[PDB]
Ligand binder design. Structure first.
Ligand code: HEM
Ligand SMILES: CC(C)(C)[C@@](O)(CCc1ccc(Cl)cc1)Cn1cncn1
Length: 525
């Protein structure tokens, strides 16, 4: 019976001929049926880690992952252990939880994975081109060296009074404070902290000129650039809407202002050591001998400040929120402040910051309970074997590492969900290499990445801003502590994190009430 083949033919014709009702209905029910079958087949393969089950094709587990990612990882971990996959808006994520997860993704060979491949679609439109994830990795490595060159301890001794000047200036003039006119008030930390962060960062990393442009309408351009830095730009990076354009406008606009200042500096020889602009001018020639274009330098500046803006500001928000219900921790930090700065007589210096271990433990502890990035990604370039398993992660897959999840595990942190800065007694450093090191182009960093506290990651893509963040957060918190007490409004406590955004920032409005420690103190100027 090719008479049966006559009928696949006939049947095919009747399919194309039935009402639109059933056809759309079939255009739905066929993919739904197919993927459900496909998964059951997949669950038989054992060169593949267990795939989380999902009903909606393409979308996969994006809803629950997007909303409560650590909760997703946990029930996932109970069911399948530390390695498992799940489908996310078209892509396939293989999650490896714990320190071996860190090792498998952060220390992965350059050939196995790509961060550029994972991130460029989201970062390049915001930062500019020619830099970060819009160049070969080797270039990235040299840029990180260029930037890290302006992040030296002597830069930090110069940044500390600039940053303090800013915080004080903010207490003086900001509508949310007015310390020379108010002794008490309410602020939204989600409003205060991003302004405080951009002011301090701008002033210290981009110099006084660029800090000054933030008082004008120009500031709004940073705010535009800011909203194009969203996970939506990670799925649909370019659809003709409209926040997508103001972003691009802002990119050239902001990048324009930097080149303007850069070109005028080389043209007057105004190239001192003031900021990162001076520094990137004096030092941005690759080792093959190519030099960064003035455009490229500017774009590297947008990227630095943008990255540093969101992590830092979220973190100082959390510090305020956790402290707001711990007058005991405030009392303790204040005593240290009095001891190290001789009641206040001594002026804050980068050196003196290092003698404030409790202040540094608070940043350490907050960064433990609140990692700004719940998920780091790579695209898999070559089929990877997972040690001590038969598992193969084929190329074209994505790997996902999550040190912020381990941070919150009792196993590695007794009472992980309690805020306790004393868990870091005689252990206050931003991080430290528990042994041997390795150098990827931007200096010797730890070779192992099996530390269960890994706030800044590791491997070639490891953060180079930890000492800047601590410096800024250090000055900022030091001053808050000496100037203010603060607490929650009645019946208000720590907000749950909003995971859907770029950084795990708190769910606003997150309000605290400040009062002056010295009502009659006046900030001068
Ligand atoms: C609390 C503050 C911060 C935290 C928790 C943090 C966290 C991280 C993490 C986890 C990574 C690795 C990402 C990955 O491997 O996929 C990273 C990378 C990086 N961070 Fe930070 N960061 C912070 C502040 C900063 C600051 C202030 C700067 C700039 C001054 C900065 C610049 C960078 C750069 C340039 C990379 C390199 C990424 C790469 O090479 O692929 N970060 N950061
Ligand atoms: C890729 C992404 C998650 C946005 C990112 O890791 C990387 C951002 C980033 C990358 C390169 C430069 Cl030169 C500056 C900032 C977030 N982040 C981490 N530390 C600071 N920002």
């Amino acid at each position: 019976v090719g008479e049966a083949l006559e009928y696949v033919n006939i049947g095919l014709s009747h399919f194309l001929a039935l009402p639109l009702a059933q056809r759309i209905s079939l255009i739905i029910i066929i993919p739904f049926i197919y993927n459900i079958v496909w998964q059951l087949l997949y669950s038989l393969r054992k060169d593949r880690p267990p795939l989380v089950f999902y009903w909606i094709p393409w979308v996969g587990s994006a809803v629950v992952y997007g909303m409560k990612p650590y909760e997703f990882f946990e029930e996932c971990q109970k069911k399948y252990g530390d390695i498992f996959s799940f489908v996310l808006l078209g892509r396939v994520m293989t999650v490896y939880l714990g320190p071996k997860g860190h090792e498998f993704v952060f220390n992965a060979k350059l050939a196995d994975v790509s961060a550029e491949a994972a991130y460029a679609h989201l970062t390049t439109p915001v930062f500019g081109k020619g830099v970060i994830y819009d160049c070969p990795n080797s270039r990235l490595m040299e840029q990180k060296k260029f930037v890290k060159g302006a992040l030296t301890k002597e830069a930090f001794k110069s940044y500390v009074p600039l940053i303090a000047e800013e915080v004080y200036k903010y207490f003086r003039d900001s509508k949310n404070f007015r310390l020379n006119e108010r002794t008490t008030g309410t602020i939204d930390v989600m409003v205060t902290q991003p302004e405080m962060t951009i002011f301090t960062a701008s002033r210290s990393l981009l110099g006084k000129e660029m800090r000054a442009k933030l008082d004008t309408d120009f500031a709004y351009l940073y705010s535009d650039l800011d909203k194009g830095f969203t996970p939506i730009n990670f799925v649909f990076p370019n659809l003709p809407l409209e926040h997508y354009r103001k972003r691009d406008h802002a990119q050239k606009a902001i990048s324009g202002t930097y080149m303007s200042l850069i070109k005028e500096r080389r043209k007057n020889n105004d190239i001192q050591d003031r900021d990162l602009i001076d520094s990137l001018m004096k030092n941005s020639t690759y080792k093959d001998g190519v030099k960064m274009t003035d455009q490229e330098i500017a774009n590297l500046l947008i990227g630095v400040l943008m990255g540093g803006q969101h992590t830092s500001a979220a973190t100082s928000a959390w510090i305020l929120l956790h402290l707001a219900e711990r007058p005991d921790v405030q009392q303790e930090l204040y005593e240290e402040q009095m001891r190290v700065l001789d009641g206040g007589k001594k002026e804050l210096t980068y050196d003196l910051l290092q003698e404030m271990p409790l202040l540094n433990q608070t940043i350490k502890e907050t960064l433990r309970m609140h990692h700004p990035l719940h998920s780091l990604f790579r695209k898999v370039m070559k089929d990877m074997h997972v040690p001590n398993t038969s598992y193969v992660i084929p190329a074209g897959y994505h790997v996902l590492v999550s040190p912020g999840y381990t941070h919150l595990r009792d196993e590695y942190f007794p009472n992980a969900h309690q805020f306790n800065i004393h868990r870091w007694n005689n252990d206050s450093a931003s991080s430290y290499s528990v042994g041997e090191e390795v150098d990827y182009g931007f200096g010797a960093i730890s070779k192992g990445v099996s530390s269960p506290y890994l706030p800044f990651g590791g491997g070639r893509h490891r953060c180079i801003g930890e000492h800047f963040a601590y410096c800024q957060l250090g000055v900022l918190m030091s001053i808050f502590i000496r100037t203010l007490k603060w607490h929650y409004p009645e019946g208000k406590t720590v907000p749950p994190p909003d995971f859907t955004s770029m950084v795990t920032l708190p769910t606003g409005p997150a309000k605290i009430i400040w009062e002056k420690r010295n009502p009659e103190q006046k900030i001068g100027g």
